[PDB]
Design a protein around this nucleic acid. Structure first.
Ligand SMILES: [Cl-]
Ligand code: NA
Ligand code: NA
Ligand code: NA
Lengths: 460, 216
DNA sequence: GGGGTTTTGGGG
DNA sequence: GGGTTTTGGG
DNA sequence: GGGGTTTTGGGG
């Protein structure tokens, strides 16, 4: 096997050529008819990656790889830009000015993906370690062989990628559209924004809250199975999106089965800049809190920074498996998202009770401050996506007698029967928490079969 | 202003507890829509979303009368006009019916439709399942939320707060998490079904019976 | 022609 | 190939 | 045997 560089490959030979390259863009493997799936990607290498830089403004130059197959599972799922792909038996030809490598996987061609970073997207998600720095994390056919003389090509190109992605944008400005201009586009376009929020709409759908360099905020539905790598605070490139003219309550982007959401490798200059540049936005939320019914989801709380890197557990696992699941028994602390259907006690004035640390009993303060230490004794009746269809409501308490979640309301416990300022603030929070589309991202601690909120503060 | 006829119609129906009467009568005008598919699934588009119209035994017949040579299961790519239609709510199993969401389906019952043969409609965006639309999905969720919130406030009473002594000083205390589960309503099974909208129901033909009835 | 598979030399 | 299936992730 | 493919009948 001989490996040719993208710019040195023959155009007149029409003979099968092989090469290594870095993937900077790619559609998702899609079906075109009753027998063919396709995946087109933009590849680069040390001899083909930049355009005539004088009047090019540092625009990226690339080649196009079109892989044809008869089965979905025979095409590469590109989740992240920057990784490497090895192709065998590709036919090159000029397609409208650019070098187009074509490979009929459904015949004799084959591909292989190599993680530029330590772990591949998948391995990162599963917390798995790579078998080695020479093992493909995915490849066509039943077998893949990495000859000893290749280790150099792979290692070198891997290095080139980092230097490359760190020195240039890779995804230049001519490769995507500004969100504040998305409505001006005639058809589909590409986006490069930060994922401000990942809202679990339902059992199989995530709703991404995007915001790019233009400051515009758009929403789009992203399946959990197809895009399990979406992460808050991360920057992604959306290949092929359309402005939804039929969405009046909120700016929405429509994706197609061939559309793809791609992240970037660690060394990405663009990703780094946009991560720090594009800051969180709550304008949509703040504004939606003025309307009776908001079709926009609002995450009312925020967990302490120390928990920011903690996987969330659904109410389903929390209440129906926490006592039978081997892995859910070793932990007593969990992070979860849900919406409040009801708050008890009904009377907001009874939210703060008097607590006698002795008899362990609490009582109403409707009659002076002697009852004891003032604490929050609130019981939330929640529900979430995982339990959306069942006839249940789950109990989540905010009992601050021991300090846990004592600041959830940003209001220190006090006799709400006498302190009008405190009672009023809580009554307002009560309306928000029970309002449709309002959610709570909170950390909880399992204490004697119950889940008490802790390290969670309202941000509205 | 909503540009999609289907979205506006189905939304107003849901927002009005599935009462086809409370929904604006200004939208009860004839509906001219393209036919994306016709078998195994008959789907029409209002230029933005596609919906599956449920034909009554009357409709499919009247159709055949003024149009004997016309096969309904072959109208694909051809546009049709509906002069007599009514939207009604129906509880279904979204795990099987892809034209629904959260086990709730807003059906378009067609009483009579005419085939505008060869008429060439205007090219529009690629049609999508209205039941996969972000805003419309949320709309339905709002619908269920209201029904769920009212149901719980009617079933849950007496501020039966978890006794604090159970969570306070609970070092030697162990409990089963399923002790926090609470039944929303009187609903029979494990599925919440305490809705207030009067679930309509009208005998409708299965797209299959209209197939054999034209090409056994 | 050459895989992959088994047809083990020959269809279209 | 900067594209549209049914599996109604595709 | 049958794809894809062009070898268009014959290798291994
Ligand atoms: Cl416990
Ligand atoms: Na052979
Ligand atoms: Na053989
Ligand atoms: Na052959």
């Amino acid at each position: 096997y001989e490996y040719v560089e993208l710019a040195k490959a023959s155009l007149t030979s029409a003979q099968p050529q092989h090469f290594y390259a870095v993937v900077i863009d790619a559609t998702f493997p899609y079906k075109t008819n009753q027998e063919r799936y396709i995946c087109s990607l933009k590849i680069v290498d040390p001899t083909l990656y930049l355009k005539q830089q004088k009047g090019a403004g540092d625009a990226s130059d690339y080649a196009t790889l079109v892989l044809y197959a008869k089965r979905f599972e025979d095409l590469p799922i590109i989740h992240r830009a920057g990784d490497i792909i090895r192709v065998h038996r590709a036919t090159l030809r000029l397609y409208n000015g650019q070098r187009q490598f074509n490979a009929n996987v459904f015949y004799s061609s084959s591909w292989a993906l190599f993680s530029t970073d330590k772990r591949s997207v998948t391995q990162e998600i599963n917390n798995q370690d790579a078998v080695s720095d020479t093992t493909p994390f995915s490849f066509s056919s039943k077998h893949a062989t990495i000859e000893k003389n290749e280790i150099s090509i792979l290692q070198n190109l891997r290095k080139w990628a980092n230097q490359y992605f760190s020195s240039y944008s890779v995804i230049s400005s001519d490769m995507y559209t500004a969100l504040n201009k998305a409505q001006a586009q005639k058809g589909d376009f590409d986006v490069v924004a930060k994922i401000l929020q990942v809202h679990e709409l339902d059992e199989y759908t995530n709703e991404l809250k995007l915001k790019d360099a233009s400051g515009q905020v758009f929403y789009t539905l992203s399946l959990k199975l197809k895009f399990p790598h979406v992460r808050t605070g991360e920057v992604v490139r959306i290949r092929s999106a359309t402005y939804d003219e039929t969405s009046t309550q909120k700016k929405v982007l429509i994706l197609s089965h061939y559309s793809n959401i791609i992240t970037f490798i660690q060394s990405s200059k663009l990703a780094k800049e946009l991560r720090a540049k594009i800051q969180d936005d709550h304008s949509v939320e703040v504004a939606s809190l003025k309307k009776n019914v908001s079709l926009n989801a609002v995450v009312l709380t925020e967990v302490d920074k120390k928990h920011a890197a903690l996987p969330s557990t659904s109410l389903q696992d929390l209440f129906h498996h926490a006592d039978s699941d081997k892995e859910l028994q070793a932990q007593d602390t969990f992070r979860t998202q849900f919406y409040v259907t009801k708050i008890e006690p009904s009377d907001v004035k009874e939210w703060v009770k008097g607590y006698d640390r002795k008899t362990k009993k609490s009582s109403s303060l409707k009659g002076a401050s002697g009852k004891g230490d003032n604490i929050f004794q609130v019981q939330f009746l929640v529900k979430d996506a995982s339990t959306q269809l069942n006839n249940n409501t789950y109990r989540v308490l905010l009992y601050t007698q021991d300090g846990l979640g004592a600041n959830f309301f940003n209001v220190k416990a006090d006799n709400l029967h006498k302190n009008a300022d405190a009672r009023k603030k809580l009554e307002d929070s009560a309306e928000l928490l029970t309002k449709f589309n309002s959610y709570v991202d909170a950390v909880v601690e399992r204490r004697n079969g119950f889940y008490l909120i802790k390290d969670t503060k309202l941000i509205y | 202003q909503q540009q999609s006829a289907f979205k506006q119609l189905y939304t107003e129906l849901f927002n009005n507890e599935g009462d086809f009467s409370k929904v604006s009568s200004n939208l009860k005008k004839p509906l001219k829509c393209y036919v994306k598919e016709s078998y195994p699934h008959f789907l029409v588009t209002d230029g933005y979303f596609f919906v599956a119209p449920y034909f009554t035994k009357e409709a499919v017949n009247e159709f055949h009368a003024k149009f004997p040579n016309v096969n309904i299961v072959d109208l694909t790519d051809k546009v049709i006009v509906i002069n007599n239609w009514s939207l009604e709510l129906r509880r279904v199993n979204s795990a099987e019916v892809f034209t629904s969401y959260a086990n709730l389906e807003a059906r378009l019952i067609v009483h009579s439709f005419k085939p505008n043969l060869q008429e060439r409609l205007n090219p529009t965006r690629y049609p999508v399942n209205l039941f996969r639309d972000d805003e419309f999905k949320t709309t339905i969720q709002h619908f269920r939320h209201t029904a769920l919130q009212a149901a719980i406030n009617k079933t849950v009473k007496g501020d039966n707060l978890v006794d604090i002594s159970k969570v306070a000083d609970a070092a030697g205390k162990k409990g089963k998490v399923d002790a926090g589960i609470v039944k929303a309503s009187a609903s029979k099974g494990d599925e919440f079904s305490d809705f207030s909208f009067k679930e309509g129901n009208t005998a409708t033909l299965k797209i299959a019976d209209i197939f054999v009835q034209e090409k056994g």
